[PDB]
Design an enzyme around this catalytic site. Structure first.
Site, PDB file in Angstrom:
ATOM      1  N   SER A   1       1.885  -9.798  -0.467  1.00 51.87           N
ATOM      2  CA  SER A   1       1.493  -8.400  -0.415  1.00 51.87           C
ATOM      3  C   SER A   1       1.862  -7.696   0.888  1.00 51.87           C
ATOM      4  O   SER A   1       2.121  -6.489   0.875  1.00 51.87           O
ATOM      5  CB  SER A   1      -0.002  -8.250  -0.716  1.00 51.87           C
ATOM      6  OG  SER A   1      -0.798  -8.992   0.184  1.00 51.87           O
TER       7      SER A   1
ATOM      8  N   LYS B   1       0.836  -1.207   0.000  1.00 54.60           N
ATOM      9  CA  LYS B   1       0.000   0.000   0.000  1.00 54.60           C
ATOM     10  C   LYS B   1       0.863   1.245   0.000  1.00 54.60           C
ATOM     11  O   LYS B   1       0.447   2.284  -0.524  1.00 54.60           O
ATOM     12  CB  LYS B   1      -1.014   0.031   1.154  1.00 54.60           C
ATOM     13  CG  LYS B   1      -1.888  -1.228   1.302  1.00 54.60           C
ATOM     14  CD  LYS B   1      -3.196  -1.248   0.506  1.00 54.60           C
ATOM     15  CE  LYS B   1      -4.451  -1.458   1.377  1.00 54.60           C
ATOM     16  NZ  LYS B   1      -4.481  -2.679   2.189  1.00 54.60           N
TER      17      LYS B   1
ATOM     18  N   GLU C   1      -9.555   6.577   3.255  1.00 60.26           N
ATOM     19  CA  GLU C   1     -10.274   5.488   3.916  1.00 60.26           C
ATOM     20  C   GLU C   1      -9.242   4.476   4.386  1.00 60.26           C
ATOM     21  O   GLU C   1      -8.103   4.526   3.929  1.00 60.26           O
ATOM     22  CB  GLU C   1     -11.229   4.815   2.915  1.00 60.26           C
ATOM     23  CG  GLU C   1     -10.611   3.760   1.979  1.00 60.26           C
ATOM     24  CD  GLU C   1      -9.841   4.329   0.789  1.00 60.26           C
ATOM     25  OE1 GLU C   1      -9.753   5.568   0.641  1.00 60.26           O
ATOM     26  OE2 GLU C   1      -9.311   3.530  -0.012  1.00 60.26           O
TER      27      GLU C   1
END
Ligand SMILES: CC/C=C(/N=C/c1c(COP(=O)(O)O)cnc(C)c1O)C(=O)O
Ligand code: NA
Ligand code: NA
Ligand code: NA
Lengths: 383, 376
Positions: free
Chosen positions: B363, B82, B104
């Site tokens: 990830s 991210k 968010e």
């Protein structure tokens, strides 16, 4: 074996053979091309080396003095420099025919690192950890458990890192035929202080190459926190012969040096023997070892590696202290200013670098070894 | 704008101006030499790119089939991919004249990634979102303000952030965390995650002398998957597989498998697949908080329809087994989201030949998930 007066091999006769065989195997493999290819391959693809050298630009300009660079060991797999040593020793143990690793841990990063390495290599891992530290470090204990290691709580003596080491040494005495004692700092009997320093030296070698790329010149100061002393030796060692490079080790000042609640072995300790080494230790008026403290649990060891005792003696390295309150203040500062949440251990180095930078000029350069990430310390910082 | 019929820009008129200015600024800066110099410098020195490609040898040999490689986004600063997107968008916003980032967050990794980028760039950060309560204090430490919402659900974060952005767009950038939302967000986020696939391609060619046979990535909104997929889309022989959250089982109705069991519709400015009851948006579930979103990105909807990528599901239990497996076998504690990808790669590997190659996008790291795995 010796760094001037400090070091040695102060162990029961039963461990002299095992220590001799570790020394033989290490001499045989340290320069062996396959051992090194494998080590470097694990460091690259598994641990994610090299770690970057980061310019803390906002922090530099806010303080208004010297440039502060951060060697990003916080980005190593596991979240600390401890992995470099773990993956150095664990395959050496395998080559010596050992099937089990044991280790001590206090903050749990070395315990986690040893478990990670053991898991990767498919070895049994038992981690000795002081009961007071186990309760204190519930999360790293779970990390160890999930990695397939057993954490053995130690209820001997003061139930902390020094007690874990005594139990590990006792275990190793009875199990050395198939067990390697994976010591996690530059401490213990020879050859461990040398071996661990050698496996951490990659940090300094990268940092040297990286600062030469960024600035064209070696740094004016390198700053690293000092518990047992492995992250500091790792970054210090390749600059030892660069005479103009100042080396500063930061010990845990705790609640203050006059408080009697700190972990500054070099600063306030005296010479003694413990865990196989002649070095500086915090000892009481009567003559036994003194209970150490620090907000940073990785700095809670009451001794320090013999090579630091040596560098202090010959005045090649300067050793300073920083308090709990100063380290906590650094933890917050770096988090908001640079978006990097440091380990509380590493924050000691950050804290001192901030003081020193202010006193220094704009074109001078400091490298701070950021030994780990702060994820493990969130509950502690809340308090 | 679109990926086939999917995607688009279905928003109130009041957001059309802001989105148009974002499109134009992105066009101006996406290939700007200086913008990329800054971005790559931060990705290198701050984020620690490139991340390695790791050959999971013990795991591979145990299963007895295809070689399993792991793209180690778990090692990115912050512990997840991210970060790649947060550090891409944040300097864009600053160049556009914004002083404030909003966002968010589901698993808190985007919330934290945004906070981290905001701290780095000296930008004010307000975040909308217990289950990942370590990430909530991480955000506070990073100087961000967390706005807890009162449904009181994670999809209501994406709802609340839009409301804020309508008023404040003059000085506020809405930093979206996945390949979702109105154009140009699905394109922008995909572009900023594509560094994963560009690295993986070069690394797998270095290591094996050939492209992989399959790339497996978990799919929530779909950003880590698009990141690794996108550079291989035009390599015909590379199969692409997305793993959605199967939850308590597809038959239980408690899952987040939007592509697998959802219906096409409009939400948060995009046409894509969503979980629906009467055609109305339906709550999702996953043990992996990052997959716990009822919708999915339009580029995956597209890829599925043209059959360029295959989308499968892995249950909570299967993900948990893979979490423990990777930890014990390779000494890597993966994020529970990432564990869905590992779990499917393990089944798939068993069918395949020893000469074949699977890349799994790892990830994230699983430090955030320890309490969840403890309770289970
Ligand atoms: C004596 C036990 C010390 C531990 N860790 C010490 C440590 C230290 C201090 O150890 P050294 O580098 O050997 O001075 C610095 N940074 C991090 C992140 C650390 O975890 C442990 O058990 O994990
Ligand atoms: Na790296
Ligand atoms: Na000490
Ligand atoms: Na979904």
């Amino acid at each position: 074996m010796w760094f001037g007066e400090f070091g040695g091999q102060y162990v029961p006769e039963t461990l002299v053979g095992p220590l001799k065989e570790l020394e033989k195997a290490y001499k045989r493999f340290k320069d062996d091309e396959e051992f090194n290819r494998q080590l470097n391959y694990y460091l690259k693809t598994w641990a994610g080396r090299p770690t970057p050298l980061y310019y803390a630009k906002r922090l530099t300009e806010k303080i208004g003095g010297a440039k502060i660079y951060l060697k990003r060991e916080d980005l190593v797999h596991g979240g600390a420099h401890k992995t470099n040593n773990a993956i150095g020793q664990a395959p050496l143990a395998k080559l010596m025919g050992k099937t089990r690793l044991i280790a001590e841990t206090g903050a749990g990063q070395h315990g986690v690192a040893t478990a990670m390495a053991g898991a990767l290599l498919g070895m049994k891992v038992d981690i000795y950890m002081g009961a007071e530290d186990v309760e204190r470090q519930k999360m790293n204990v779970f990390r160890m458990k999930l990695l397939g290691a057993n954490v053995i709580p130690v209820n001997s003596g003061s139930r902390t890192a020094k007690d874990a080491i005594n139990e590990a040494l006792r275990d190793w005495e009875a199990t050395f035929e198939y067990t390697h004692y994976l010591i996690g700092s530059v401490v213990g009997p020879h050859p461990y202080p040398t071996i661990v320093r050698d496996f951490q030296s990659v940090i300094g070698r990268e940092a040297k190459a990286q600062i030469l790329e960024a600035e064209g010149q070696l740094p004016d100061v390198i700053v690293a926190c000092v518990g047992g002393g492995s992250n500091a030796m790792g970054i210090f060692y390749p600059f030892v012969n660069d005479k103009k490079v100042k080396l500063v080790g930061v010990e845990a000042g705790g609640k203050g040096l006059e408080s009697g609640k700190h972990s500054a072995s070099l600063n306030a300790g005296q010479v003694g023997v413990l865990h196989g080494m002649l070095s500086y230790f915090l000892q009481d008026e009567e003559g036994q070892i003194k209970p150490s403290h620090s907000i940073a649990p990785g700095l809670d060891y009451p001794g320090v590696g013999p090579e630091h005792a040596y560098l202090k003696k010959i005045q090649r390295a300067e050793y300073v202290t920083v308090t709990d309150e100063e380290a906590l203040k650094a933890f917050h500062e770096l988090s908001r200013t640079e978006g990097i949440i440091p380990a509380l251990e590493s924050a000691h180095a950050v804290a001192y670098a901030m003081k020193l930078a202010k006193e220094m000029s704009r074109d001078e350069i400091i490298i701070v070894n950021l030994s780990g990430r702060g994820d493990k310390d969130l509950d502690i910082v809340l308090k």
